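Support case: user asked for a sample of complex input and structure output to validate their parser. Sending the pair below.
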Amino acid sequence: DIAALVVDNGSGMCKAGFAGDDAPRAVFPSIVGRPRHQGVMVGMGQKDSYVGDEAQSKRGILTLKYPIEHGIVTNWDDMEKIWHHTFYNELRVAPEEHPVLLTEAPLNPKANREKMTQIMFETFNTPAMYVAIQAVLSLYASGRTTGIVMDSGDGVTHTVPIYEGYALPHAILRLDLAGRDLTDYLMKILTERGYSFTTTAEREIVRDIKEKLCYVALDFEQEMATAASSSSLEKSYELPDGQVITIGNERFRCPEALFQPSFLGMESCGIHETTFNSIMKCDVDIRKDLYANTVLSGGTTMYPGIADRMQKEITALAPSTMKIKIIAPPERKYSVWIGGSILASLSTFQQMWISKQEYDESGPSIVHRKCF
Amino acid sequence: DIAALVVDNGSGMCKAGFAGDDAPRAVFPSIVGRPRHQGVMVGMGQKDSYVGDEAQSKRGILTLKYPIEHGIVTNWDDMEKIWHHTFYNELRVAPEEHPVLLTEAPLNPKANREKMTQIMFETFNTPAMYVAIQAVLSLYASGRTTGIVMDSGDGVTHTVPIYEGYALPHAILRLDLAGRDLTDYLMKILTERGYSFTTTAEREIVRDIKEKLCYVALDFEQEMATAASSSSLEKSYELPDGQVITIGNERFRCPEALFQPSFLGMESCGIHETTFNSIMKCDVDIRKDLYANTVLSGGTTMYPGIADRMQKEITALAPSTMKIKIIAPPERKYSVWIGGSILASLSTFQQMWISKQEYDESGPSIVHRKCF
Amino acid sequence: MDSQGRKVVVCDNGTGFVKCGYAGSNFPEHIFPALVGRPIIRSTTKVGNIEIKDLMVGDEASELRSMLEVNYPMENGIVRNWDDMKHLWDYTFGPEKLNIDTRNCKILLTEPPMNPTKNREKIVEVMFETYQFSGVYVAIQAVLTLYAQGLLTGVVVDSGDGVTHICPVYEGFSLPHLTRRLDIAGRDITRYLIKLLLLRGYAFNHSADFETVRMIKEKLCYVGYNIEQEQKLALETTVLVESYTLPDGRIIKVGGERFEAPEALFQPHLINVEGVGVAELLFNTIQAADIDTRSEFYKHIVLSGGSTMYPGLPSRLERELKQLYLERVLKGDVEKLSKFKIRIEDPPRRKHMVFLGGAVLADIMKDKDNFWMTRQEYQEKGVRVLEKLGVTVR
Amino acid sequence: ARNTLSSRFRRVDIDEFDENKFVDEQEEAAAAAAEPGPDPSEVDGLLRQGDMLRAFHAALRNSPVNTKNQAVKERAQGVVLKVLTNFKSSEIEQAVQSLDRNGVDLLMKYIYKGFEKPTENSSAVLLQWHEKALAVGGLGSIIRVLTARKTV
Amino acid sequence: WXAXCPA
Amino acid sequence: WXAXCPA
Ligand SMILES: Nc1ncnc2c1ncn2[C@@H]1O[C@H](COP(=O)(O)OP(=O)(O)O)[C@@H](O)[C@H]1O
Ligand SMILES: Nc1ncnc2c1ncn2[C@@H]1O[C@H](COP(=O)(O)OP(=O)(O)O)[C@@H](O)[C@H]1O
Ligand SMILES: Nc1ncnc2c1ncn2[C@@H]1O[C@H](COP(=O)(O)OP(=O)(O)O)[C@@H](O)[C@H]1O
Ligand SMILES: [Mg+2]
Ligand SMILES: [Mg+2]
Ligand SMILES: [Mg+2]
């Protein structure tokens, strides 16, 4: 097999698989748990560290560390274990055989790209590699050359407009506000009912709550008075110990931070204004093409009601003449990987790689020239 | 005291003082900060809004709004607080007693002049007023009647040639590219090192960095390879929390946008071509007089190396026969106000005013006839 | 006392100790523990002199805890047993403490942050129905800790018996997105001191013996500036070993249990708590703030509560912060540390600052009507009277 | 239990770089030129003829207490300690009784310094000296050895 | 508390 | 990050 490999390396998840395939082969969380007690039972596979789903199975006795935060890698020692867990254990392939396609958010520090490319060669001995923008890959899977992508993951949220394969970097915007900032906000408001979640493991439980009961309100202030009057939104959730909780108002107050970050204290503007303000920075000619081809990506865009609230708010700002059409496919949680298998399966792409010899002569700084 | 007052009202700063004086009495930024939290400590001078240096002292808990953007006033309610803060608090004078001399950039919408003159009379009850072009005042302070001025401020950059007191409006050019567009560009490239500045307060910090470490390169592509080889330009800056940063290449990439706006995506031409193209629109006879009397103004022209790079580029375009002489006095950040105290101190100017009664009979549209 | 003569009362209603008094007071009138004790028969004890009521409260229970089964109504800032909490409020408003008439008085109360809402609604429901207080206010423990110190800007550290919370303020502007709670306080220490004394053979299983270990903690236990130096003293010498005589005459000996128990405020994993200590949390709360505000937080760190009264806590706290400033801000530049300006306000009256601040805000607002919450307002609106404070309730 | 976060900040010690540390004073006038101390030829020429009681006072007259240098102190100690070791055990009370108070204290300082590094029989003598100087000077002589911030 | 921790 | 935000 000479198929290229693709790795997303999001803030929360690691989506991996082969090129040419339609969906990733391995999906696991980007966490590395180290125990918090002393294991005295000997000969029982008691390892110094656990990775991926093997940690979530043992989260009770571990401290879960997300090595990535807001897109940046904070711990490179742990991140080697992630990739090592991806190739050898999940995909069950050597990396020196195939190439790999990595991803990265825009407006990240250059030292993050310099280190990844340094690691794929000097550590894993890959033959070549490449580093793409996450939003751009989402459009390849969408089958377009015109449209603005809004990828919202676990740590980062960024907009990227393109027009006929010509990206406008002056209009790209980033916003460090994503699911992990929402998960933490949910744990702060759940105290109002009487539910306390502090531990990292308890943070993963609340993640499962967020992605099962939280929806977006088309009108926040209207549904605010609905819950005050009735008990229709009061859904329940069963904790693993058997306890039971109930959340009403807290289902749509969590994702509203995307549209009102002032709850989190952040001075920034909502995603509904960010993607709009990005479009206003593009040329006056191509705005209409992007109002129609407005695409969403990332797991954070899987809330129900997210497409209707964006369409509502965008219409209110933009002129009444322009027609706002949101694109929200039912696989937008993996769109960035799907485009990667597409982009690596192309004949034109076989020259954009950064081979072993090119890194040997230019060093890791070649990534800035080769990879845009 | 019957001394006339002078107010610049730039995009970033408000320079104020009396006529006949050599330097302005009050200089403060044109910002109006409103808090972003709820003040529960009562009886503690907790006002609804802060203005000027009182905001920069409290920028941490505020959203700084520049009411002016690219020369135009976007918020007139906030701009009254600016003038009200100028007369009553800074200058400590009533405006109905003295007249006032305002300024404005060329090729602005007429509704901006109509509103200022409406405000000085109907709100402040001034006896008269006048509205001058900012570039023209810079030549009065320069002691000339022949020369082309290039005033570059915080939001606007415009060229104005004059020949023996006869202005050529057909050759005036404007360029919406100035310090606030450079400050924002600096915050985009500083991410490459790993420094993130998003908040408005953090935008004011980066302003202080820009006006302390950024210089102009006589040859951009030459110094680009200097920094890649050595670490001589690597200067450092101490943030108020005690953190420390270091910037090399980013010191001359920020002001180069004035000479290469393609970094910002703008299709326009650099200031070095704008002032040249303006001269080429003047008569063939008077070009030589303007190549010599080439004046700079505005705080944006206080970079070191700005005079030498303009002289270099202008020489390369214009013929070798013409001698290029740049004029860059060490007070060019206040030249536009200095000329205002001069122009109001003249006996010939005492008739160019627009009195209270003249506005009462003709309305605010008189400004278009009286004020050129 | 207000213009109308109505006494203005300030009750903290803490988790381990009640601090009740009147406005403008520079001390509190009465400071007694928040426990209720019912009678019990035990074979070891024999007493028939003092009358033991069916419901003893406060100081008359803790003194007679040998003949009682005491129980704390409040735990971690939250109220568990209301029927035992009202018997405490009665004792607080009765002939034994503050012999006042509730119908002709104003009251000021406190709740910690990020607590449930039903714990606040149910208190106000009780003060207007049961006691029918004329005017009520529910203050924030952080803001009161500043009034007593005379400030408008300072990160607060308020550690008590059940709760340890951190609330930054900047010129009177609340920043609740930075509020943090550590789940460790004087009760989680008192348990850890029993689990350590158990190695020496001393067993304190009963509910009365829980107070006896609190007194052992308040007297002996302390905090180590450099924990390595303290461990040398316990290994090389035997000077840390003190002695405590119990009510039953039995004598015990306490050594390295003096700095190991309260170290769980800085090394909280010793009591099975995942996270970081009060110092690395206070440094991370600040590093979350806006960059311009950080400089004035380091200068105005304010302590409070009685779990900050361990000998050596502020010095230990100043130390651990400068280690982190050096390590993360300055990246290891010792030469710049001399310019780092940090001042930890550790006044020895920090045991009651939440109360003293309540005396100060009451005396300032005793004679205003838009401040308090009236019985008439609660009759009309109900629990929605709290909207005056900005607490969204229906 | 165990923790899983970086706890390396608690290892560095900031108390070393402190400004409130104590600073004791020294004699400025002695740093340039040190006191010459008892010259060997003076005492020795008095030892050749056997005049011990006068070589005795010659060694206690000069004493480089104000000197910051340690060699002249060590040379001074070896001189007086050479003298005390050569005395006749019956003559010691005759010599100790001659001294004023301020010489008995300086003597007991040198005695407690001879015990630091003894020869074969340097200490059986100094214990006899210690008995006499204590009979005259009492415990207060020793306390002015402990409290003495300036070594002999 | 009701969920998580006792109180 | 190094300055601004944690990472
Ligand atoms: N059904 C869902 N509803 C709401 N949020 C979801 C859902 N599924 C995933 N998420 C969020 O999406 C995030 C992961 O997004 P994804 O882009 O797939 O990976 P990454 O964010 O690491 O790039 C998680 O942090 C999670 O909170
Ligand atoms: N020393 C300096 N170096 C570089 N830029 C400066 C300097 N001083 C001021 N500036 C810039 O000049 C601008 C203000 O120019 P000025 O003409 O005085 O006011 P305005 O631009 O509002 O008319 C600011 O936006 C600032 O960035
Ligand atoms: N000398 C002392 N040393 C250490 N802790 C003390 C001392 N005195 C009192 N304490 C502690 O202070 C706690 C009470 O703090 P406080 O905040 O006043 O009450 P609450 O915790 O109910 O709010 C008690 O739990 C007690 O353990
Ligand atoms: Mg993603
Ligand atoms: Mg200007
Ligand atoms: Mg308390």
